[PDB]
Design a protein around this ligand. Structure first.
Ligand SMILES: C[C@@]1(Cc2cn([C@H]3C[C@H](O)[C@@H](CO)O3)c(=O)[nH]c2=O)CN([C@H]2C[C@H](O)[C@@H](CO)O2)C(=O)NC1=O
Ligand SMILES: C[Se@@+](CC[C@H](N)C(=O)O)C[C@H]1O[C@@H](n2cnc3c(N)ncnc32)[C@H](O)[C@@H]1O
Ligand code: SF4
Length: 340
């Protein structure tokens, strides 16, 4: 608060780039322990004796590296592509889906070759133009949370602003957004914040900024002319969820009083987990009250990836309809982009 790692690895190749040169100067000056790693894909010697210890310590470790895979993943329903600037998070959200996506790489990775990345993104925009091409910057990380250390997203925001047909979006649980307020976004960045019921935030979201912290930060960026949006995720059927999520939109609208919310968007994601995740979360978060009972769920078989448990179609529709009614009640004119 804000995130500063207690251990930093550098790829040798990273030091050949401006941002790699800058971060090495910054972190050595701060007196942080710094190491070499032959690849950010395989970093050795993270302290701990149990897997759980190394997990906690990885989430305090930064790895400055080079993006060698320049081909972008698709990132639907959010965006055509995920622009890869970072991988990993300092948060300890019990439900986090990165526990399966980056289960083996729980440290924070930032890539230094922004010229390569922005170039390739420009290629993708050219491939589809004059159609709009969206890029998700926070698909596998809390890019905003860590950006104060690198300013990589700020640069990504300004690059996209310079393009005609390119668009950027990202979502965060962190309030540390002041350095992004004077960025030349040119209306092409959707700045989003993850929100939830009080039950879910308090019980399942340690290491993140409080609901009020996210809303203060939300007011600032809307005040800076960014496009604003929220991601209600994970939508979770805890005891009194109906009332729990009613008071969310009630408090949300209250904290966004007297503001231009004509271009406000909402995205809705029901809670989901994989079969591995149930045993991964049980040890990584022992005393969590997060229900991972598959008998309350339906298994949605995978296509290219592995399948996952979601709520039954009927219970899923109850959630969607409830969130839609609440958004329509407190935020008339706002647009629900999707429910998943
Ligand atoms: C912030 C996200 C980013 C995102 C991630 N992902 C992938 C990458 C990540 O590793 C994986 C997690 O299962 O989900 C995706 O396919 N589409 C996305 O839009 C988060 N998600 C999640 C929800 C679900 O896990 C998956 C598919 O919708 O993406 C989403 O739908 N909307 C977003 O805006
Ligand atoms: C991995 Se999050 C990356 C962006 C940023 N660090 C952030 O937290 O907002 C992407 C979103 O998806 C949700 N989410 C995370 N895990 C799950 C999940 N298992 N099921 C259902 N949803 C899950 C989180 O609440 C986020 O709103
Ligand atoms: S913040 Fe977004 S990413 Fe970091 S843990 Fe909570 S969910 Fe996973």
């Amino acid at each position: 608060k804000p995130f500063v790692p207690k251990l930093v690895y550098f790829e040798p190749e990273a030091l050949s780039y401006p941002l790699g040169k800058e971060l090495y100067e910054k972190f050595t000056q701060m007196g942080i322990k710094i190491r070499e790693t032959t690849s950010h894909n395989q970093v050795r010697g993270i302290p701990g004796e149990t897997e759980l210890a190394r997990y906690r310590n990885a989430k305090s470790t930064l790895v400055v590296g080079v993006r060698r895979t320049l081909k972008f993943d698709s990132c639907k329903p959010s965006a055509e592509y995920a622009i890869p600037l970072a991988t990993g998070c300092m948060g300890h959200c019990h439900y986090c889906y990165l526990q399966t996506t980056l289960g083996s790489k729980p440290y924070i990775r930032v890539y230094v070759n922004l010229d390569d990345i922005f170039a390739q993104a420009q290629k993708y925009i050219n491939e589809r133009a004059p159609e709009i091409t969206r890029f998700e910057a926070a698909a596998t990380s809390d890019i905003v949370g860590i950006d104060h250390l690198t300013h990589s997203l700020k640069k990504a925001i300004e690059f996209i602003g310079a393009t005609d047909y390119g668009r950027l979006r990202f979502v965060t649980k962190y309030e540390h957004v002041d350095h992004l307020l004077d960025a030349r976004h040119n209306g092409k960045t959707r700045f989003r914040f993850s929100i939830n019921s009080r039950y879910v935030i308090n019980h399942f979201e340690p290491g993140t900024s409080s609901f009020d912290g996210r809303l203060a930060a939300a007011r600032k960026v809307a005040g800076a002319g960014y496009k604003l949006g929220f991601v209600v995720a994970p939508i979770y059927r805890h005891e009194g969820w109906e009332r729990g999520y009613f008071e969310l939109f009630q408090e949300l609208a209250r904290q966004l009083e007297g503001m231009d919310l004509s271009d406000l968007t909402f995205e809705l994601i029901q809670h989901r987990f994989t079969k591995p995740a149930k045993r991964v979360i049980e040890q990584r978060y022992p005393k969590t009250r997060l229900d991972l009972d598959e008998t309350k769920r339906k298994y949605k078989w995978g296509r290219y990836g592995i399948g996952k448990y979601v709520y039954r179609d009927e219970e899923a529709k109850e959630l969607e309809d409830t969130m839609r009614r609440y958004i329509e009640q407190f935020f008339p004119g706002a647009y629900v982009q999707y429910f998943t």
